[PDB]
């Protein structure tokens, strides 16, 4: 293109709305705020959650629970993701990472039985689901808990 024939994509750009610049805009005098009150005032408005003195929702309601600071979360992978590999291959966490199926090994890798495998391979991981191990061994293959 040419700098003197520049043109943006359609729908990419709008002009901003300028308030307080006369009647014919429809945003002139009050600038959209209405006439009086707490919200017409500069810096006005009421803080979020404030209900006017009625007890807020998050004090009507009770708290419950606690957080486990040392919690185990596992990088999840299903059978339908393993179909990209070849039969007889031996898959490992490092091979998963290299293939990009797993971006982050959090506390180990876990294999879940959502999809359909249609393959035959050996797997080495930390945890398995019962359906996953069953569907691995059904077509042929082994699961070795690391």
């Amino acid at each position: 293109m040419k700098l003197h024939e520049l043109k943006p994509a359609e729908g990419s750009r709008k002009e901003r709305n300028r308030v307080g610049r006369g009647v014919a805009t429809g945003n002139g005098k009050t600038s959209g705020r209405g006439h009086k009150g707490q919200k017409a005032r500069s810096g006005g408005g009421v803080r979020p959650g404030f209900e006017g003195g009625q007890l807020p929702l998050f004090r009507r309601l009770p708290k419950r629970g606690f957080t486990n600071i040392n919690r185990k979360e596992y990088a999840i992978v299903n059978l339908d993701q393993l179909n990209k590999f070849e039969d007889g291959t031996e898959v490992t966490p490092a091979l998963l990472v290299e293939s990009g199926v797993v971006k982050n090994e959090k506390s180990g890798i876990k294999i879940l039985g959502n999809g359909s495998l249609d393959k035959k391979l050996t797997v080495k991981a930390h945890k398995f689901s019962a359906s996953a191990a069953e569907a691995i061994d059904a077509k042929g293959g082994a699961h070795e808990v690391i």
Partner: protein, 64 residues
């Protein structure tokens, strides 16, 4: 700077899969003898934050 989270709401509510907020029920933790067993067991059922309240308290839990 960063937005700050409302901690009292954070340890009162959790976020479901789609976008909703699951809460706990009030009128527990104290006198039940005036109440019936039906009320007792039914106040153990969870509920969702109403949309009318979400329209007000959305920004308090954006990082949840």
């Amino acid at each position: 700077p960063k937005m700050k989270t409302h901690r009292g709401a954070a340890k009162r509510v959790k976020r479901t899969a789609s976008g909703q907020l699951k809460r706990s029920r009030a009128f527990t933790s104290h006198l039940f003898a005036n109440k019936s067993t039906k009320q007792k067991r039914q106040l153990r059922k969870a509920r969702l934050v109403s949309k009318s309240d979400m329209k007000r308290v959305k920004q308090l839990l954006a990082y949840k």
